[PDB]
Design a protein around this ligand. Sequence first.
Ligand SMILES: Cc1ncc(Cn2c(C)c(CCOP(=O)(O)OP(=O)(O)O)sc2=O)c(N)n1
Ligand SMILES: Cc1ncc(Cn2c(C)c(CCOP(=O)(O)OP(=O)(O)O)sc2=O)c(N)n1
Ligand SMILES: Cc1ncc(Cn2c(C)c(CCOP(=O)(O)OP(=O)(O)O)sc2=O)c(N)n1
Ligand SMILES: [Ca+2]
Ligand SMILES: [Ca+2]
Ligand SMILES: [Ca+2]
Ligand SMILES: [Ca+2]
Ligand SMILES: [Ca+2]
Ligand SMILES: [Ca+2]
Ligand SMILES: [Ca+2]
Ligand SMILES: [Ca+2]
Ligand SMILES: [Ca+2]
Ligand SMILES: [Mg+2]
Lengths: 524, 524, 524
Amino acid sequence: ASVHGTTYELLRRQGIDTVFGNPGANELPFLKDFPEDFRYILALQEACVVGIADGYAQASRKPAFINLHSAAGTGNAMGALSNAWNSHSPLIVTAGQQTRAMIGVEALLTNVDAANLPRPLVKWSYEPASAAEVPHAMSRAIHMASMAPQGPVYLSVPYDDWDKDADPQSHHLFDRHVSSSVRLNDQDLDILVKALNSASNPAIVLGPDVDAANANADCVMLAERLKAPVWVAPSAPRCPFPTRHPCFRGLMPAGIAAISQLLEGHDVVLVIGAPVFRYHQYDPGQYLKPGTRLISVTCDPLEAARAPMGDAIVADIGAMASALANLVEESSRQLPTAAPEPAKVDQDAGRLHPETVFDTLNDMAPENAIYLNESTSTTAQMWQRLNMRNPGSYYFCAAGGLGFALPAAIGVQLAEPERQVIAVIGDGSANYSISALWTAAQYNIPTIFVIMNNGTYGALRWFAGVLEAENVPGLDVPGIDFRALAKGYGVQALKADNLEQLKGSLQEALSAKGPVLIEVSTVS
Amino acid sequence: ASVHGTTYELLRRQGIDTVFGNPGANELPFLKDFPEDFRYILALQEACVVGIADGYAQASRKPAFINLHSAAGTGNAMGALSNAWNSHSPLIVTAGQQTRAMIGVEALLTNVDAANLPRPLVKWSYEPASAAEVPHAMSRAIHMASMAPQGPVYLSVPYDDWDKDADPQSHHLFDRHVSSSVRLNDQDLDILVKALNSASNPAIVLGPDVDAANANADCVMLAERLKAPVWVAPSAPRCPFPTRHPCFRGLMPAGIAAISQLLEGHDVVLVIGAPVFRYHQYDPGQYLKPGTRLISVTCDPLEAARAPMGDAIVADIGAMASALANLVEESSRQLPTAAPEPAKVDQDAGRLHPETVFDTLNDMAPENAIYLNESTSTTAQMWQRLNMRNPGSYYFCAAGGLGFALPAAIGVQLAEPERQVIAVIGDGSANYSISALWTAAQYNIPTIFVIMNNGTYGALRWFAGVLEAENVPGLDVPGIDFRALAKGYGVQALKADNLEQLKGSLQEALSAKGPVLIEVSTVS
Amino acid sequence: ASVHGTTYELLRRQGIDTVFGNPGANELPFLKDFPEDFRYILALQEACVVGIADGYAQASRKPAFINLHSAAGTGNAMGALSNAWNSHSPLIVTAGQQTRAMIGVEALLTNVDAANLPRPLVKWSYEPASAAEVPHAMSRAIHMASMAPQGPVYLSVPYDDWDKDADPQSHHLFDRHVSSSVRLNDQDLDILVKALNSASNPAIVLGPDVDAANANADCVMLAERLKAPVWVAPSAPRCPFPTRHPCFRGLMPAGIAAISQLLEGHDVVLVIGAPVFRYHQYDPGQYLKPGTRLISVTCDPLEAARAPMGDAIVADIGAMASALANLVEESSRQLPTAAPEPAKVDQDAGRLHPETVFDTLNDMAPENAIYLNESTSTTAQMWQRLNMRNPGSYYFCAAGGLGFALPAAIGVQLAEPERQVIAVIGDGSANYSISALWTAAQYNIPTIFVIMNNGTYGALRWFAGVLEAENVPGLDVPGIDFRALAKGYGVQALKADNLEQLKGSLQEALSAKGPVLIEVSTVS
Ligand SMILES: Cc1ncc(Cn2c(C)c(CCOP(=O)(O)OP(=O)(O)O)sc2=O)c(N)n1
Ligand SMILES: Cc1ncc(Cn2c(C)c(CCOP(=O)(O)OP(=O)(O)O)sc2=O)c(N)n1
Ligand SMILES: Cc1ncc(Cn2c(C)c(CCOP(=O)(O)OP(=O)(O)O)sc2=O)c(N)n1
Ligand SMILES: [Ca+2]
Ligand SMILES: [Ca+2]
Ligand SMILES: [Ca+2]
Ligand SMILES: [Ca+2]
Ligand SMILES: [Ca+2]
Ligand SMILES: [Ca+2]
Ligand SMILES: [Ca+2]
Ligand SMILES: [Ca+2]
Ligand SMILES: [Ca+2]
Ligand SMILES: [Mg+2]
């Protein structure tokens, strides 16, 4: 067998059947003779390739496979890898290298010092020393991406390797099963359970690795047993809990002092599947108030090490959540009462308040919709206004890197064809990965894109005001016609200048057979 | 003085007056109080920011200053940095970092291990250890980008540094002059000149660093004195010689055997300002035929080290070209005779042959036009069909990384407001950095964009045929309306479906007061 | 031809005839069939291997070739590479890698991520992608080490590569000549010369790259023409000027304020072949006083970039020194007058003052002796008390890293068999690379080692007093018998407890046919 044939066999035996890519000359020897059981998903720029694969992996809860061109293609994707690192996304990033005979002279298309290029945004990065090593290196990539804490990996392959003879002993790679589905030993788990059972006023904080593990329902059981309020950790990349469950208390503010004040009075705070904590604004103060003890369960040693307070347990979130849910006592405390709905913002017959948009989406969208957020100034309101009952219902750029949601929404929709995806994207954010629209059109992936057009980088204007920073350039983005951009890439386009038009456009979009973009005129 | 005030003073004293950027929260404390003598050029995605700055630096022959957001913004620009490295572009890339008090906890927006992120695509990469070090680090960045061999550099700055007190002794940085304008010592230069004077059949090969140095006219003098044919080194990022001068022989093919056959019979081959050589295709054979000696003059130790043959001299290309032009004897050989014009391809009243497009551009464009090429399957024909008399007339992605020419053409046009820029971009290539169009519209930078629309990644279809590679996915890009994309970003748009319409559209474009995009229907 | 045969041919054609090494299993396929025209110099630990090669390269003014074992052997040498980086030493460091078939499984002896291991202490670091690339990679290593600014490089080679067939076209590598012997263009050089001719009170500061270039005599001519005092830049790794010439003013103190005060009143300060400046102690103040302009000539862009003041020229030091010496006017100012000899320290019949030791060495040693210094508390006195008329007469660990002088003195003595080498090494410093003594014994390299035994890390006790730092552990090193260590490794040993015994021991050492160690009891 050839390295080509052996590698595709390994991929299929390890559950991979889709290549997300943008091709180049070093990749043609890999992509030739493309197997009939595989699917290739083309995107027009590599940030879009990786974003689509990322959404697909996160929603599918399985690795996604990517093929990019050399250095320049890898480089175009490195902002997308920044988000993927922070979301623990299991991405297998391959890139083609020049033929081995031409690497030394640094022919055009040579990826110089290739394994260093994507660092520090990958768990493992490698170029094999020979063609017959390629299947083994691919095996390592698969497993490294997939083991807890999951994350992106990088493999560079000289193009001449594919046609070489493989080692027959590479067959031992095909069916390897590698597990990291581990939890705290019984004796120490019993100590933890006792501490939770003994707490007088526990709180729970959940992060994105809960949703990644599909631990949501176990966390519901845990919270009901402990009679405990539940917060989502700050800067949330995913939604780990039903947002209208009685215990839910919403998104934590991303500041040190704000979080310790919120937790004040809670004697035990159990954090599951989050960093401690993904703060954002500078908000100095106490990490915890006196009287509060924190215990973190994380899948990531790096998280456990850097937490400034609390104890930690490094384990698989699914296995831990299930064990805790099933082991804790049912408390005799009263169950928390559900938060009331938020205020209805007054809305005239002109430009839309973002709150109106979210309320209307929540009114009209199916109960199993999936939302993506890249409307950076409206996140707090979005989190209050969408009833998200089910797992896998929310994604937000995990490193704060714009250009995620537009492509990722396409990947999520591909992963979840029965669940309507609605991406809510600011007019600024929409440009970073605009060409991803084409993939939705060409593959008929029926994502709905809601562009919140206020003409400005609103979240930056807000931060500049918090800074009392004057005379800042570059904050306005006038003069973009998003209906014309959608037309450019083959996507049906609608405009909503007022609430009547928003409702009409959403009605049309929700019944369409293909992707749809709605440009919404929002308040400045 | 503050670090902010001291840093902007250093920048202005070192000739910097423009910031190419896409802002974020870590950069607002740098960008606030933006000096009135500086200009900010916004682009909507970081590949576009860096591409525009790159074109501006290359055309202006001076450093360009960039400000990007953290890790994600830097990451989005790394494909653009791949080209910048290969073109020796003097780019000062700054990125904002989290406040020092929040770096340890890895708050959102922290650039982890920041100095490693852009490697290996930068000459120098650094994060200062204190706020008062920032002006000095900026000084180092300026000089490192600007010294031969020029190239990109990276500086990460925690956002709290700007408001701190500067060291008063940073004033010594302001007026530092750093020169690398050096040439071979007289004794060894005399040996070289003797070897050139003694050659019976010399040839000259020129690369991009000639055009960067504005050494073109000295190279003309050299070639006329030596009575020598002149080739442009393969994979050419720039044009180093007048393309209708009698000595000009065109673009070398990017293959080992092809180049040694071309040089056969030339006893001395002098290469100036090029790698030896930027081969592309696999074309094995002899590096040089018996009888040919090669001498390379390069500004880059890395080039000199990796050449597989010949002697080398590492020196400034401007200083060396001038010294050689003025020192060599006038040979009594006959001057080379000019190449004839190429064939006129037969053209019906339907879709355009690329050759027709280039001939028409050459007919209609001003004699001081500047061309950019990202029409990857048509490069050889472009090189034969454009009469480029002047320096600075051609740019092509120096690493082969698509997404360069569209933004770079905007930067070149900003650098050279009297010279009409015409970017010839394939329909595939146009998507990588499509949002750069907006910057042309907003700043009214009157670049002309000629989109060669054949519906496919034509250069990849060609390579796949050379490979006899069948069943390759991802090679077709149907269904893009480039007039609608131009409308989306505010650029006047025209379509040319035949030669009559091409001429009419070019006539309109050449007289327009703003940027114009022409979508040309080219043969498949 | 094999890769083995081709590589040794390249080495010999490029002037390499000696391998400094400590062997291991991955290196046996390189070292087998060792050519009869090569010499292997074994040392017992890799810090010693590299130190010996470093001294040999620095004294010989040519590259030295090293072969180490994998990761562990490379790792043992990284402190030695720290010094080599700072001294611009042209060292070609090769290390053997596992066979390509075993690298993926990470068999014992695999050097993981090999090219990253010696960073940031090398100019270039690489592992070839195929066996036939090895000769080319070796070529690149040779040239990268040898081009200005010279420095160490690293090449990792899988052991199975050596027996493979080489590319016949590797013959083009054998006789490549690569020059970086460049100087400032005539127009700008004339500006510099005018500035020097016009100065009313010039000063010259010289660094180690002067001695490396053997530019010493040109600098003497320059100083005599300009009638200028001459200082050696701080933290001096080499001696660039005759220490009893009338212009010599000694070693500059390694502090910011101290140097600006020293230069006060000098209108133009010309620095040649030094960083600006290798300060050590914290001594805050002005970089330069008003009225002083600084101009630096450096072979290293990194030096030029980081200088906090002055103009800079990046060029070869030999070519620049010769051009300046020959171009400047003879000033009518009076020549500086020579410094008087230093004080004679009062010396009783007991333990030796270091000053006594240096005076006695200067009395007894040949005029062409070469000194190495690793007696860290006595450097200022050493610099005042040794008359060093000739180039190549002094070496000191250029990064301050102990373990250099003992092995380097062996390499220097091998490089300069007619010049008696005398290494003056503290009792603390002697231990770092003690096993290097064996190489002197086995090869009969007649270095004299003078161990200054005061029982303590004296320079650290001094710094702790400057800090008023009390209760510092680890500063005393009692209980070392250096005569017994010398016996252990086969070196003749003598003890000097007083001046009479010092003179007797030096008389014996200077007439010995082999290496000799003298343990001197020095004052505490
Ligand atoms: C790749 C990248 N570049 C720049 C930014 C900076 N950025 C920018 C540019 C923001 C404004 C986004 O504007 P929008 O129109 O999408 O939404 P709002 O108007 O609601 O803020 S929010 C912020 O973090 C970023 N995070 N990521
Ligand atoms: C960033 C990046 N991604 C992918 C490629 C691969 N690439 C691609 C995708 C080519 C086709 C470009 O198509 P085009 O329409 O712009 O021009 P032609 O049809 O004339 O080839 S040429 C080639 O090198 C690349 N070089 N750079
Ligand atoms: C490899 C290494 N380790 C530790 C040190 C620290 N070091 C030490 C340990 C010094 C004392 C050397 O003692 P000595 O006996 O050689 O000489 P003095 O007593 O004259 O200081 S000087 C100083 O920089 C160093 N520079 N290099
Ligand atoms: Ca409602
Ligand atoms: Ca699915
Ligand atoms: Ca907005
Ligand atoms: Ca014509
Ligand atoms: Ca200009
Ligand atoms: Ca095309
Ligand atoms: Ca004396
Ligand atoms: Ca010698
Ligand atoms: Ca001592
Ligand atoms: Mg990197």
